[PDB]
Ligand binder design. Structure first.
Ligand SMILES: [Mg+2]
Ligand SMILES: [Mg+2]
Ligand SMILES: [Mg+2]
Ligand SMILES: [Mg+2]
Ligand SMILES: [Mg+2]
Ligand SMILES: [Mg+2]
Ligand SMILES: [Mg+2]
Ligand SMILES: [Mg+2]
Ligand SMILES: [Mg+2]
Ligand SMILES: [Mg+2]
Ligand SMILES: [Mg+2]
Ligand SMILES: [Mg+2]
Ligand SMILES: [Mg+2]
Ligand SMILES: [Mg+2]
Ligand SMILES: [Mg+2]
Ligand SMILES: [Mg+2]
Ligand SMILES: [Mg+2]
Ligand SMILES: [Mg+2]
Lengths: 128, 63, 51, 109, 216, 225, 124, 19
RNA sequence: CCACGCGUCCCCCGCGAGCGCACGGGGUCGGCGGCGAUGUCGGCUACCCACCCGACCCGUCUUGAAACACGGACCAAGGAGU
RNA sequence: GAGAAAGAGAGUGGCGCGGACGCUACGCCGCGACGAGUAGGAGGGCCGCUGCGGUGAGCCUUGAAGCCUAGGGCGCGGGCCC
């Protein structure tokens, strides 16, 4: 089995779809990253019915289950082995993640140090 | 809905000084405690006066 | 605190109003006693039907 | 060795004229046609049973193609014995006018 | 210490005693009943005497630990809930089992077991239904009863007797209890005409047959 | 030594327990006397109507002094005079409701607002279930739901109002401190009327729901509550 | 003093590390390794620290002494504890409790000693 | 009796008489 | 009947113990059942397709734009309060 | 936390070595009511880009920047990590 967290609440998320920016589906020049549109006759901005939704604050996640992975953990981006004695104490809440640019002969040292220190790694078998 | 007007809904006054001075903020940490935890209102006035701006606490003279 | 309903729930009602216990005792005694009295008048009327 | 489910038809979602709410099915049960008469079916497990392409499990048996979406019957609707159901995942509109079984087993009799 | 009495208030409705506080002062007779005012063992060792500490300190501490829950009151465990039947189910009632592999079959109900469940046999000579438990909710109860009050159900069969162990092979005392209760039930239901054919037959719904309209 | 400290704190804890128990006996016998007073108030009007009828004369009863006022029409498009009188009657949301004692200033304030409200003369059962089910208190301008008698007694103890049924007695028998007790009560937030409204935009006389239905408000509190 | 040093080290220190909406402090004598006034290992007159030994068994417990504050070489005292897991924790408990030596974090030291001993008994 | 200062001896007398 | 006993002066007529049940400062079970190694189990989101309800194309000037108002074929880089 | 201006105040005579979390005080927590928005104004950005002083005994030929991706994800979102 893996390394189970301390507490594992049911993570209720209010919305699972992303917010695509209005008329991102039309053009290639319009990238789908959300921009609140300042049009004066704009059908989305003034909230018509059946239109693209807007990202209000009320879609914000619960603070107890925010940034929380489906395993129950939270990430922490780790570059070297000296950044696992940091999570030596946050064993049950915060899990480690190895950076992309980190070499193989250092990534496996990170992985076996985290296996000693009982810290779950999100990507423990990355390159090899 | 409710027919409130939300114009003056937010009190404008300071919660903290706009200074990153650290001796002033340690005096704030002492008088936050004394104003929160005594019943004397001298400490609340001294808390509110450490909060202020340079042009709100003008220098009185020795005269 | 969660507001429990004093009209449905009973010990909240007694927590707010301890005389409500004797008003709701005396009225259950009253309902049962008047019920017995009306059943006795109905059975006496059936005896009058037999006579 | 016969049928143990009443026949019901998924008429539509619970809807208004310019809005529908897909969390609540409208079920039309055969034979009951009044609110005086719909009282027996409140709280019954209802189910939309459908087949598929690839095999899935079947408890108390071996895997086959058939699949379900369970639910329950919540409250009457209208005056013609129409009723509301809530399924644990919302019904596809594939199911409009197709047989939902409405069981008997949460009995109160 | 004295021998305990029972509650001198007869329960009128739930939560309300039939006698007020002064009447219960009188009935309890408080007027004449007034009043006024570990961790170490020492063991011998072949040395001296060693003061062993039981309840030792823990060997390990987890790096992060949950707090204690808030205390709430009415949330009893399952084994001490209050158990209810429906009104339509009395011992002797014929039932229509609706959910198991014995679905649709008509069955004589015996008694209300300790964990809420019903005890069941439509006798195994008739419709191949053993001494089984059945859940109250999952069962249509018809209005067909037998005069079952003069039977002796064995006292050694409860939830701990029917609860599953872990190929399933029928033990001997299952057969012995099955026979010892069927020899008491089956002649009692051959006394009612056409009842054994009813209990061998299965319930089913055909066309034009609606359970709200039909009385059973 | 602490052989004195623990017995002194036990004597203090026992003293405040005995004080609380005497307060609960006070609240009990006050609620009993209030029940007797309501019996006498209800039978007095019947007895006087009977004596007037057997003397042949008529008996105009006491013109009612306590109304319950419900805002039935929404925020949008309200004349400003009606706006100001509604927000002195503390009917801001739709389907709110406040108790209001009646006199010459108050009745005329109510009939400025009259197309926007439904107001009537509530029964003792209406006053009861409004205080028990929807009755919260404006404590330190927060809306604390009234769960104990101490929430009422810490704010209204100086008007000799120490429990919830004493608050009910004040509201129903409009007393000296009706202003203070009613203003302690937050404006009631009733639900939409179960069964419905016959017509929102017309007076009760004209086959509608606005205006002064007199004691038919006790039909309507029961289904907005 | 101590608060004066904390008002400087609280945001612009090099042991501080801020990413993934978390914050930590990688300083050499920090129980629980997190950025706080309570646990900081540089700004107090008295401080414990729990480190694994150079030999791969047991815990070196670091104490900050009282006299030589401005003398960083003869400021810290090491004690190596290479025992069972019960008496190692009992020694750290007595050392921080019965000296009345900064008892804010006796339990944090016991957690950290236990986590080191967990990591120091062999792997599954 | 039930208000604190003036009913102090009264509540004390009831508390003694309960024995 | 939310009334408790004693002792005295007056008038008119302050610490008793023990347990236990719970309509009592927000859910628990000290209750269970199934299927699981080459075909199944879980992944809302992201790939395709289907169905129902909704659903006019953006910017802009406007009292009012989907307009039979003007600008816009598509894309990459540059591009405007210094 | 308790309906009631203010002391679990001091004085003078008649065995077992045990007790969770916390408090980046710019932190953490508790109560209530509230949430429309063009022109506009303000706040917060652990949103983003390029360069400089510090710093991470940072990363990198055991493969950095970039680019592609039906893969796993986080955040209301800007975006970001794999
Ligand atoms: Mg336009
Ligand atoms: Mg417009
Ligand atoms: Mg609103
Ligand atoms: Mg506004
Ligand atoms: Mg403003
Ligand atoms: Mg209008
Ligand atoms: Mg209705
Ligand atoms: Mg359409
Ligand atoms: Mg233009
Ligand atoms: Mg122009
Ligand atoms: Mg024009
Ligand atoms: Mg304009
Ligand atoms: Mg045109
Ligand atoms: Mg033209
Ligand atoms: Mg033009
Ligand atoms: Mg053109
Ligand atoms: Mg560009
Ligand atoms: Mg807004």
């Amino acid at each position: 089995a893996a390394l189970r967290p301390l507490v594992k609440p049911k993570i209720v998320k209010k919305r699972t779809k992303k917010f695509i920016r209005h008329q991102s589906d039309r053009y290639v020049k319009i990238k789908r990253n959300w921009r609140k549109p300042r049009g004066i006759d704009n059908r989305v901005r003034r909230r018509f019915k059946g239109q693209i939704l807007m990202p209000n604050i009320g879609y914000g996640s619960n603070k107890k289950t925010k940034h929380m992975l489906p395993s129950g953990f939270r990430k922490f981006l780790v570059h070297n082995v000296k950044e696992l004695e940091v999570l030596l104490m946050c064993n049950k809440s915060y899990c480690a993640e190895i950076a992309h640019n980190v070499s193989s002969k250092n990534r496996k040292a990170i992985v076996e140090r985290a296996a000693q220190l009982a810290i779950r790694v999100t990507n423990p078998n990355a390159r090899l | 809905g409710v027919d409130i007007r939300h114009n003056k809904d937010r009190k404008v006054r300071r919660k903290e000084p706009k200074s990153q001075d650290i001796y002033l903020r340690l005096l704030v940490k002492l008088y936050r405690f004394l104003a929160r935890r005594t019943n004397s209102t001298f400490n609340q006035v001294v808390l509110k006066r450490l909060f202020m701006s340079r042009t709100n606490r003008p220098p009185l003279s020795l005269s | 605190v969660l507001k429990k309903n004093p009209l449905k729930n009973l010990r909240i009602m007694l927590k707010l109003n301890p005389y409500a216990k004797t008003m709701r005792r005396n009225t259950i005694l009253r309902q049962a006693r008047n019920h017995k009295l009306r059943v006795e008048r109905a059975a006496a009327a059936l005896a009058a039907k037999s006579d | 060795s016969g049928r143990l489910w009443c026949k019901a038809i998924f008429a539509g979602y619970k809807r208004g004229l310019r809005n529908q709410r897909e969390h609540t099915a409208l079920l039309k049960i055969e034979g009951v046609y009044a609110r005086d008469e719909t009282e027996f079916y409140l709280g019954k497990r209802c189910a939309y049973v459908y087949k598929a392409k690839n095999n899935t499990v079947t408890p108390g048996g071996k895997p086959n193609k058939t699949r379900v979406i369970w639910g329950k019957v919540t409250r009457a609707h209208g005056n013609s014995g129409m009723v509301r159901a809530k399924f644990r995942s919302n019904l596809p509109a594939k199911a409009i006018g197709h047989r939902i079984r409405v069981m008997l087993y949460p009995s109160r009799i | 210490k004295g021998k305990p009495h029972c509650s001198r208030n007869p329960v009128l409705v739930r939560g309300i005693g039939r006698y007020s506080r002064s009447a219960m002062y009188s009935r309890k007779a408080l007027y004449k009943r007034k009043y006024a005012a570990l961790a170490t063992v020492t063991k011998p060792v072949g040395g001296g005497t060693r003061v062993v500490k039981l309840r030792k300190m823990p060997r390990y501490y987890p790096t992060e630990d949950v707090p204690r829950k808030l205390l709430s009151h009415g949330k009893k465990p399952f084994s001490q809930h209050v158990r209810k039947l429906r009104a339509s189910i009395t011992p002797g009632t014929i039932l229509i089992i609706l959910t198991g592999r014995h679905r649709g079959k008509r069955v004589v109900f015996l008694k209300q077991l300790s964990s809420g469940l019903l005890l069941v046999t439509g006798p195994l000579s008739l419709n191949r239904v053993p001494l089984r438990r059945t859940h109250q909710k999952f069962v249509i109860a018809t209005s067909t009863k037998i005069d079952i009050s003069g039977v002796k159900i064995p006292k050694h069969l409860t939830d701990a007797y029917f609860k599953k162990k872990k190929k399933y092979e029928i033990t001997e005392q299952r057969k012995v209890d099955q026979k010892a209760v069927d020899s008491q039930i089956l002649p009692k239901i051959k006394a009612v005409p056409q009842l054994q054919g009813y209990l061998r037959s299965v319930f089913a719904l055909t066309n034009g047959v609606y359970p709200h309209k039909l009385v059973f | 030594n602490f052989a004195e400290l623990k017995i002194k704190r036990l004597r203090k804890k026992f003293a405040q327990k005995m004080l609380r128990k005497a307060r609960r006996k006070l609240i009990y016998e006050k609620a009993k006397h209030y029940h007797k007073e309501y019996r006498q108030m209800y039978r007095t009007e019947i007895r006087m109507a009977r004596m007037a009828r057997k003397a042949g004369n008529f008996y105009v009863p006491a013109e009612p002094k306590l109304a319950f006022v419900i805002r039935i029409r929404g925020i949008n498009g309200v004349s400003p005079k009606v706006r100001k009188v509604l927000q002195l009657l503390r009917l801001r949301q739709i389907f709110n409701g406040t108790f209001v004692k009646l006199n010459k200033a108050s009745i005329n304030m109510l009939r400025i607002v009259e197309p926007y409200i439904a107001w009537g003369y509530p029964n003792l059962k209406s006053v009861n279930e409004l205080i028990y089910k929807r009755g919260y208190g404006k404590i330190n301008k927060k809306r604390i739901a009234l769960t104990d008698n101490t929430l009422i007694a810490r704010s209204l103890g100086k008007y000799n109002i120490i429990c919830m049924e004493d608050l009910i007695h004040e509201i129903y028998t409009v007393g000296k401190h009706f202003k203070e007790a009613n203003n302690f009560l937050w404006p009631f937030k009733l639900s939409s009327p179960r069964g419905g409204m016959k017509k929102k935009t017309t007076h009760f006389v004209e086959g509608g729901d606005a205006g002064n239905r007199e004691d038919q408000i006790n039909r309507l509190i029961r289904r907005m509550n | 003093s101590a608060h004066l040093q904390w008002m400087v080290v609280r945001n612009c220190s090099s042991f501080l590390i801020k990413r993934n909406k978390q914050t930590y402090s990688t300083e050499p004598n920090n129980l629980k390794a997190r950025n706080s006034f309570r646990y900081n290992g540089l700004i107090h007159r008295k401080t414990v620290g729990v480190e694994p030994a150079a030999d791969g068994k047991g815990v070196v417990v670091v104490m900050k002494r009282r006299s030589g504050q401005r003398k960083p070489a003869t400021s810290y005292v090491r004690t190596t504890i290479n025992k069972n897991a019960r008496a190692t924790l009992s020694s750290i408990r007595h050392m921080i409790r019965k000296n009345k030596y900064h008892p804010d974090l006796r339990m944090a030291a016991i957690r950290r000693a236990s986590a080191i001993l967990r990591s120091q008994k062999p792997v599954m | 009796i039930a208000h604190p200062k003036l009913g102090r001896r009264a509540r004390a007398r009831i508390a003694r008489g309960l024995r």
